[PDB]
Amino acid sequence: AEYVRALFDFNGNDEEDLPFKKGDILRIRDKPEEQWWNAEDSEGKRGMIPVPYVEKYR
């Protein structure tokens, strides 16, 4: 699995999006676009995330 960590907050402004807050660890599910990836949070919610707002989890 591929995990990322949020660097910034994201409100989730389209309904496909997954909102998140800085520090959230998210699992990457799919990369349909270069900068928008499908991700899942610690509650199991899913949606699209802006890649610029996250880093590799390590």
């Binding site: 900068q35 928008w36 707002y53």
Partner: peptide, 10 residues
Amino acid sequence: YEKPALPRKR
């Protein structure tokens, strides 16, 4: 500190 640009969608 400064937030990146929110990227364009397809």
